[PDB]
Amino acid sequence: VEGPEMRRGRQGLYETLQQTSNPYQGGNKVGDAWLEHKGRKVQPRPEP
Amino acid sequence: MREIVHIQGGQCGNQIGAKFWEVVSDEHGIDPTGTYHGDSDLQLERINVYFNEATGGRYVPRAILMDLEPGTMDSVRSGPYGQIFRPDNFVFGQTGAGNNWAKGHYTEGAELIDSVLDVVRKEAESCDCLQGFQVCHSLGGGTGSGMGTLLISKIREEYPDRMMLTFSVVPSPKVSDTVVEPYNATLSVHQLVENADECMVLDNEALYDICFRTLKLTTPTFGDLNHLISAVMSGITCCLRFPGQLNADLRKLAVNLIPFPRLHFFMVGFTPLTSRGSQQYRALTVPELTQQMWDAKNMMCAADPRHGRYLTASALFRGRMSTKEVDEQMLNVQNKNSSYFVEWIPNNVKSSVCDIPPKGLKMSATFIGNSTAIQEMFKRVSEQFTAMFRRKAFLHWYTGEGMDEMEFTEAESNMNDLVSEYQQYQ
Amino acid sequence: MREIVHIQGGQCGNQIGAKFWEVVSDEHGIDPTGTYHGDSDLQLERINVYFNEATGGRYVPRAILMDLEPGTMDSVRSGPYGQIFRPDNFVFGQTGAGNNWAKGHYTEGAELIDSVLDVVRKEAESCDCLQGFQVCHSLGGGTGSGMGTLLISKIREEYPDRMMLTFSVVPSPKVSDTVVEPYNATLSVHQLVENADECMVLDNEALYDICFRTLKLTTPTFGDLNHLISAVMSGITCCLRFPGQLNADLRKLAVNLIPFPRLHFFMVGFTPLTSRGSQQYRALTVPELTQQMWDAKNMMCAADPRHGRYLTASALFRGRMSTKEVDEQMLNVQNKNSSYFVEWIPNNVKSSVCDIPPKGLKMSATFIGNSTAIQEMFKRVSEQFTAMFRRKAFLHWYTGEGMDEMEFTEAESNMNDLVSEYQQYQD
Amino acid sequence: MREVISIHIGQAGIQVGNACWELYCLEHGIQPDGQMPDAFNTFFSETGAGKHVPRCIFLDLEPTVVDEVRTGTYRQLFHPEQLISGKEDAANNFARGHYTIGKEIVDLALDRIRKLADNCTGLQGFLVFNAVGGGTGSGLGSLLLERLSVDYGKKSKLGFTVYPSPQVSTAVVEPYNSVLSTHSLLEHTDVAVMLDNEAIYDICRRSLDIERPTYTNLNRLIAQVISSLTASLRFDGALNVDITEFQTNLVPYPRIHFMLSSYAPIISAEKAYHEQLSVAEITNAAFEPASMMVKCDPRHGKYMACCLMYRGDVVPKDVNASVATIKTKRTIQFVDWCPTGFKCGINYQPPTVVPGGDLAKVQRAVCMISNSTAIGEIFSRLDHKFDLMYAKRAFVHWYVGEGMEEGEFSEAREDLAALEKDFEEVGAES
Amino acid sequence: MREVISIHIGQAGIQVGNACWELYCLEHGIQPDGQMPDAFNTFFSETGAGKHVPRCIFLDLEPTVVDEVRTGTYRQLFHPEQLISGKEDAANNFARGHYTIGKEIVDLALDRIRKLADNCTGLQGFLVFNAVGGGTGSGLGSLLLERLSVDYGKKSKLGFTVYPSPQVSTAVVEPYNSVLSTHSLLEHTDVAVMLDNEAIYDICRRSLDIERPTYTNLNRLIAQVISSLTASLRFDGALNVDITEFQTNLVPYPRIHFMLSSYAPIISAEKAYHEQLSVAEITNAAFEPASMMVKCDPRHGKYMACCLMYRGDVVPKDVNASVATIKTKRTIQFVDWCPTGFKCGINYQPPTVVPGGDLAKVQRAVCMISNSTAIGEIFSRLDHKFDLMYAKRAFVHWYVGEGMEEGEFSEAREDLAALEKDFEEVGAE
Ligand SMILES: Nc1nc2c(ncn2[C@@H]2O[C@H](COP(=O)(O)OP(=O)(O)OP(=O)(O)O)[C@@H](O)[C@H]2O)c(=O)[nH]1
Ligand SMILES: Nc1nc2c(ncn2[C@@H]2O[C@H](COP(=O)(O)OP(=O)(O)OP(=O)(O)O)[C@@H](O)[C@H]2O)c(=O)[nH]1
Ligand SMILES: Nc1nc2c(ncn2[C@@H]2O[C@H](COP(=O)(O)OP(=O)(O)O)[C@@H](O)[C@H]2O)c(=O)[nH]1
Ligand SMILES: Nc1nc2c(ncn2[C@@H]2O[C@H](COP(=O)(O)OP(=O)(O)O)[C@@H](O)[C@H]2O)c(=O)[nH]1
Ligand SMILES: [Mg+2]
């Protein structure tokens, strides 16, 4: 029967150890606590 | 041609070496079906160290799986890269030790050691110049703790001049996994003193600490800890399987890390572990590898290295790396921290470089450190045994199987003997 | 090979220090991603002052951002130019001091200041030569005051041969943003006198009338306020990162502007402040720069320079300028009104020229004034602190965390010492 | 991650708790089923997949008000175990809520709080809601407030208490229960933000211009005050404030911790278009006495410490400009020893509008929460009412039967003499 | 091969076993007729062409509870002659199930154990299910466990025994039956797991909010615990615990082998939506005393040994953090000579849900079995009930005439007297 993270979505430590891919400009955003820090809302407006 | 025979012991050993061959075969470019799919001839340049050529290009490891219950036989067979092993190396029991060190060593280990010793004798004779034997097991259990240490005593008598690499996990201090850990560990360490050439101490709670703080993994699974062990198991044999500007095999490390024959326990770690968030922003250079090398948070042992003096140290750098930049930063860490290195051995740190790095990484390094701080693990394991032994609890299981209580009394005496020997050199 | 470490503390520090990193990244020419996109090769000459080389040519700032409240780093990362900072430098807390100097300095700082000196030390010996440290925090608050000044005290003990800038914002004269501002201002001053090598003061109402009367904008926001705060700090280090005819490093800004070690507090002013509707009528000539630079309205502190003389003045000119007109204008203002200058220092004004101007503008200047008129900013806070303390107001919150009134008596004793010695040298 | 655990005791708290949690689900967009169609995380804990439960307990000895929530529009919103009921109510008796009935329910009540404490990582504080005139509002809260202080050290508590008006009240022993509850909230509650029942009736009649309001209408604009002060914790702002920021900013002395409350824009939907709602107009309306949530004339008293909670499209200069204009007005008077009297908390979100509510959609809003010396007028009239009640020991025999003793009446009266004399001397010029 | 044989003795054995194999066939996909539409070998032996039969025997002296299984929906699952019946009941007589009518029925039982043991390749242990208050469970269980000890030496024998409650005893001669059963189970059974029918009643009333529970709802909760202890065999995990792993790591002394039982998440369907069930929260619920399945208070005792069986999607990272947080709590106490008091076992399959059962779908679950010094409270109390009854020889004439003479009462009294002296010295610091 499959383990926890095989059904969570993140599989193995290949990407984070071999340092392939990239969190920014990429697809994988499921691993790192800095990445799942959501943070407050954004109300953007350029400086006048 | 300097080949290594792998022995995997018990629940911990069979799971560690499952991911260990899952990484090394990927490092050498081996697909799940055991054939070859690589691109550089350097990968196939030294495969006799770990693999055997078979008919049709099949690559089978020299790994002997040994355990007392058949539960882990399906666990490694149905896993990823789980079919690469020869079936004659699947020597297994049926009853299970049940965390009974006496059962793995005396009662049911007797009818299984004579079977696993035939397989090791089969694999050792087929290969030409044995660099040594690698064993992986646990110290808190009964199958890899008891029957694993019985294999060490038998294999040392048969091959006394060969080298034993003992890979052991130690019971964690802050968290307990089995109640009988003081009985299992203090007994298993004692035969590791006279028989094992060198031992490489691992610890689970240090591996949990590394994943949560350094790698910043939200969920570190049971195999993520296993993956970090395999990254350092593959680093010890970096110079064997690959060329290098400065070569350092197993025996060159052992003579430079063992000043006295009973002080052969090491604390180890892997340098270039950066989190996914801090992945881009790290300028991967030699100063980064050194400042993470001697960080106490990067160690994979329960003992803080700042507590006890480093007796000897070893570094195995990997990558196209400047040999001066290695050397001028070994001197930097020795001079900036003078009290943590022992005085009566000049030039404690020993460094070597392997020209090819692991896949996807450009600069990497693995560590071995023979420190006198590891008595903190040794003293703590022993004092749990002394509190256990004076009440004689959890002992009727042990003494009902062929151990009188006196054989335990040499166990803490030898355990107190090493903490006496570590005490005088610090 | 001179490296400047930027330190931001608290709600005000992490928000307005972000915009300082907005303008430097816009002026050195790096994108929000982190790569170089500048036109000239002059920008790449001195990148090491503020940024670290990394993998893929990315430049990560030498900045540690630190506070006790998690709300700021939600805002810091979400804003533009927010991805560039290293997350290892993003050390934060969980409780939050909440405008209290005692919680930041003693109670809830003690479990975190040991963490922030691990992060600072990692970026300390990473670079070659520390020129010093710069910090931009708040004095009316508590998460950047108490937590900040303890860091400022600790780094001087560890690194005593390096220099300190404190771009500290003081409470406004006519309005107050927090009730307990006079306590946290005076307790921060008592620590910043003996630890900070020099101090530059910014005041929000001094920014408010500038952004309305001179910049002719009806509703500037806080981002408009922080821009002139961000613009002046880039004028501090203009001569470092870029060549020029005459170079003034940041140690020059210390050794020249400060006659005595206690008399180090300054005031700052950005010179070319013209609106969008009034720029094309104005001729961009260095007489027009020098008249605005010496104006009382242009200063970004609560003081009025007609009250007190300048002990030492400075000017950080940026661009291609004729230095004869630069020299003779400062000579003229020294000769037009010798009453407004301190008499017992001849030729009080320093000028240094950076050959490249900032983006868009072609001629600019940055006034640094160690004026004795800024004792009014000290005195008005000092009379507020005496009046609040004499009824022991708001004191059980402070003394309950490990404070006693001995420091509060001592904090006043250095507070009124400054206004006494600043008035003494004016006479 | 920071969280706040609101506490509501008494049926006044539950009806406020029905109104206050109505807006929190509406403002964050939570449907009554409890699903999302990290802003919720300061009030709602995630459970499983896309589900939110309130970080609150509804403990009350009266079961009819508790199960009304269990059968209302929010059946699947609240955790049924967090809603704690009682077999019999205290019924305007502090003795019944503190000693006899209260003891067998606070053991279960603190267990839920302990279960709530481990779920949240960093707990910012507790918001306590009760009516000091009620039995379980005075009794059960007082037993609960002292148990929280001995369990969680120094953690912030916000007393959002409902006091009876000296001119209008709906029970005869509310002076007894308010006096006895005040004896417990001085030593425990960090900030006691006051609310008057009759004062907000005048706001609905005059400013909100609805001539027939009910308690559902009255609780909503109270609930709009509660969200405005905590929205800075909820949402980003130019100058954010916190729960922990508020106590050390508005309480100068450890036994003067009472706050008056005022909400500036109170206009109807038809009035909303015709009013030029503006930053100067709302701030000038904030200091206007009829906008106060508590029936006070601040001309008689003086403002010691004040606090401005700004929501919406507010630029920094006019809120600072409104600071200067108030200080120039001789009508608004401050005590001479607190020159820095304003805290400006600006939030970028305009307040939400409740469907079917009397309040209209507005862009800018101000929540004034200010300490003042006019609060002693409330406690003097309550003490004057308590003096007539205790002059002949009427309504005392109920209290002595259920555990309480005669001497507790004198000790609670002794504190209000000390509280009243402390209000006068602090406001006294020196 | 990992192969275990479970025996069910007495009325409580049959009803627990009926709810047991109900959950076991649903776990492995076995239909009630036995037709599967690799891991079944722990409890089901494959027979012929695609049919599986339980590795159990339902032996009892009441014919009414045995043929209820025969007439029930599981007529095609169990073997016909593995459901052993009896002509005459023991009828609350310990001497009858030991000497009078227990002799002629134990020979048929041993034949079916031998036939089942030869069918299984490697036997892993024995599971027994009884209530010691009844005549059949105490009497025949004394004789049956005696015979398996001689026949099957040094083999693990797991005991799931149900004891009379402090407050409730639904039979009068239960203090006689319980004390005389403990004389036999002390030397022979390897691990005994104490259960009390009235502590499970408190669990069902509070956790499952059922005001009217019955024996079937009690046995659903028991079947979940037995499955959780044996799920390590049937499915893999990061840390899997054999039944042979279990005895040696939790039994410190030969005469101390009684265990407590705890299952952490007991949540109905309505409450499962709102409760955030994570590892740190449930490990506090496992050590919570109201969730303990016997009426001994662990605050009075000291935890000597403790085993944790974790089911479901349990990561191993937080179970180390969860155990350490328990050890930092002051209320949970450990004996001074055992600093290492935990055994954590992690299994990857979630517990199944039966259709119509009170338990709901839960992602992660914890089964805790511990050894504590508070077990002397349930043994000194039943000592007081038996000593008071033996003061004037109540209900003794029934026992004397059925073979068991008067010495066995004094002998079993002295055996439990040494047992009471045994718990007070092991807890001594
Ligand atoms: N503002 C406001 N006040 C309320 C509301 N409901 C009740 N009150 C006030 O609360 C007073 C009664 O006190 P409570 O604490 O509610 O009485 P209780 O909770 O039933 O106390 P017990 O009788 O002991 O159960 C009334 O006089 C009202 O003035 C409400 O919804 N809004
Ligand atoms: N766990 C559990 N215990 C039960 C159940 N039903 C009855 N019991 C217990 O069993 C006790 C009755 O004694 P038993 O051992 O069942 O009686 P018996 O097995 O029929 O033995 P004899 O009557 O002598 O043939 C009661 O006191 C109950 O506590 C059940 O369904 N589950
Ligand atoms: N790093 C690591 N440690 C393990 C692994 N498996 C088991 N352990 C450790 O080994 C100890 C118990 O070993 P055990 O399961 O009893 O081994 P056994 O004797 O073969 O059954 C525990 O402290 C575990 O933390 C593994 O795959 N990796
Ligand atoms: N220019 C500017 N000043 C600010 C800003 N935020 C706060 N301040 C100043 O800082 C003081 C309040 O800071 P505060 O938030 O309490 O600091 P902290 O809580 O300790 O981090 C006020 O006097 C403001 O003048 C901002 O965004 N821009
Ligand atoms: Mg009520």
Side-chain angles (χ1 to χ4, degrees), chain A residues 3-47:
Chain A
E5 284 154 27
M6 285 199 281
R7 78 182 69 91
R8 297 291 178 89
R10 201 199 93 262
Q11 309 217 67
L13 290 192
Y14 283 165
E15 53 88 19
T16 187
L17 177 60
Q18 315 280 276
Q19 305 210 3
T20 184
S21 69
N22 197 302
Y24 304 99
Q25 67 264 9
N28 297 115
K29 300 288 291 317
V30 296
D32 186 74
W34 168 264
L35 265 47
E36 292 84 4
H37 284 90
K38 176 67 178 176
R40 289 298 106 179
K41 315 209 313 302
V42 181
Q43 314 262 16
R45 200 258 306 277
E47 49 90 18

Side-chain angles (χ1 to χ4, degrees), chain C residues 240-254:
Chain C
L240 279 188
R241 310 161 288 115
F242 293 131
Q245 288 175 172
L246 204 51
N247 295 294
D249 60 308
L250 270 65
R251 193 169 286 281
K252 166 41 60 188
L253 273 297

Side-chain angles (χ1 to χ4, degrees), chain B residues 30-75:
Chain B
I30 303 304
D31 51 7
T33 185
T35 59
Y36 186 72
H37 285 344
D39 44 15
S40 300
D41 199 27
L42 293 150
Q43 301 189 354
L44 282 193
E45 181 261 353
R46 207 90 59 180
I47 62 170
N48 299 318
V49 285
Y50 278 166
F51 285 93
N52 287 319
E53 181 63 42
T55 304
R58 198 64 176 263
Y59 280 26
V60 294
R62 317 161 160 285
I64 294 91
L65 298 182
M66 61 80 71
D67 197 327
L68 280 157
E69 63 274 342
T72 53
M73 170 156 178
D74 205 354
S75 173

Side-chain angles (χ1 to χ4, degrees), chain B residues 295-371:
Chain B
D295 199 316
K297 266 79 76 177
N298 204 13
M299 291 320 289
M300 298 193 293
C301 180
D304 180 40
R306 301 178 304 253
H307 287 153
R309 294 177 176 264
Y310 283 104
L311 197 55
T312 61
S314 176
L316 314 174
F317 287 90
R318 285 165 57 74
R320 285 291 285 279
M321 190 180 290
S322 306
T323 60
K324 195 261 208 185
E325 197 174 2
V326 163
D327 286 331
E328 63 90 18
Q329 300 177 5
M330 296 311 105
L331 266 172
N332 188 19
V333 67
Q334 290 207 129
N335 293 319
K336 283 298 287 185
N337 304 322
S338 56
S339 67
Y340 304 152
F341 277 109
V342 65
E343 311 293 322
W344 56 271
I345 299 96
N347 304 340
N348 273 2
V349 56
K350 189 250 188 174
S351 58
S352 83
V353 293
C354 177
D355 57 358
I356 191 70
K359 328 181 82 173
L361 274 156
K362 200 181 292 183
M363 310 284 279
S364 80
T366 72
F367 183 76
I368 297 169
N370 192 12
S371 85

